[PDB]
A paper describes a structure:
However the wild type [name] from [name], which shares 71% sequence identity (85% sequence similarity) with the homologue from M. barkeri, readily utilizes ε-N-butyryl-(Kbu), Kcr and ε-N-propionyl-lysine (Kpr) as substrates and can therefore be used directly to incorporate these different PTMs into histones. Here we present the X-ray crystal structures of the [name] from [name] in complex with adenylated Kalk, Kbu, Kcr and Kpr. The data show that the amino acids are held in the [name] active site such that variations at the ε-N position are allowed and key features can be deduced. Taken together this provides insights into the plasticity of the active site of this enzyme and shows that non-natural amino acids with certain key features can be readily incorporated.
For instance, a direct link between activation of gene expression through crotonylation of Lys on histone H3 has been demonstrated. Using an evolved [name] (L274A C313A Y349F) from M. barkeri ε-N-crotonlyl-lysine was introduced into histones. All four adenylated amino acids occupy the same space in the active site of the aaRS domain. While the adenosine and phosphate moieties superimpose almost perfectly, the amino group can take up alternative conformations by rotating 180° around the C-Cα bond, as seen in the complex structures of Kalk, Kcr and Kpr. Compared to the pyrroline ring in Pyl the alkyne, butyryl, crotonyl or propionyl functional groups in Kalk, Kbu Kcr and Kpr are smaller. Thus more space and a higher degree of flexibility is possible and not all atoms of the methylene spacer carrying the functional group are fully defined in the electron density. Our data show that analogs containing only the peptide-bond motif, can efficiently bind to the active site of the wild type [name]. Thus Kalk, Kbu, Kcr, and Kpr are recognized as substrates and fit well in the pocket. The data were processed with XDS to 2.05 Å (Kalk), 2.28 Å (Kbu), 2.15 Å (Kcr) and 2.2 Å (Kpr) spacing, respectively, ensuring consistent indexing and choosing the same set of free reflections.
Author numbering: 188 to 332, 335 to 378, 385 to 454
The structure:
Amino acid sequence: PALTKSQTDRLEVLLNPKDEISLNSGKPFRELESELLSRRKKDLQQIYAEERENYLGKLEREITRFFVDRGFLEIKSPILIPLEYIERMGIDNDTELSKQIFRVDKNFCLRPMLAPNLYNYLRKLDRALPDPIKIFEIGPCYRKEGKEHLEEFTMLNFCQMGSGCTRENLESIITDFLNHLGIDFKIVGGDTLDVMHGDLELSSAVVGPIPLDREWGIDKPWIGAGFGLERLLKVKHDFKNIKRAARSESYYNGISTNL
Ligand SMILES: C/C=C/C(=O)NCCCC[C@@H](N)C(=O)OP(=O)(O)OC[C@H]1O[C@@H](n2cnc3c(N)ncnc32)[C@H](O)[C@@H]1O
Ligand SMILES: [Mg+2]
């Protein structure tokens, strides 16, 4: 008896990349299932006995160390933000991204991006800190939305404002960062550059200034980029589905919790 599509879906939940196992081998479902459950339980037991770190938390800590060591100030800003910030980002009620916003009250929303809060920090810190101003944030962002898109994800955004805000310097920070993480990439590109892993977008990056700056009281050169942490994990651990890298009750470090 061939496996049913339902059975195949069930085994794929339990399959980790590099199991080196085939599902067209003439072994019954119940036995293939039992083998995989066994391995996945062992994977959790090993994490529990040895490291005990969540991949998303650990990646955040590794990224944080990278940027702190390179001169960037760690920011932790509100996740719940004024709706007015979305309009001031130039996102009108007719825009597709406007339909993607999770509204909370009359006046607030879950941030879909880190830029508005970072804009405010750039303007404020420019009164206190020497040139250039270098900051970053890592945290939750939200968009109503795929095997590449989550509704609840985690962004890194870094930026620099003042001197040294060139395309060359932006590409160099991106290059050092991803070679540090061990992630293969290419950069394709007032500029806008995309950092790609094959067909998967890891980042959009920007060389300012841009006209939007003035709405935020910013009038200096700047560079920046945003990376999705779940996308980075997906590539690093070779997950077939990005849900394996997300905040979840169904997966822990890419291992099914439904055992
Ligand atoms: C003061 C300015 C600061 C500054 O830093 N400016 C330049 C920042 C670049 C602008 C940039 N930060 C931006 O505007 O969101 P975008 O939709 O482009 O997404 C950026 C990345 O987030 C990830 N990502 C986005 N949506 C996702 C989803 N639904 N699921 C998973 N990952 C996702 C993915 O890795 C994507 O490439
Ligand atoms: Mg983009």
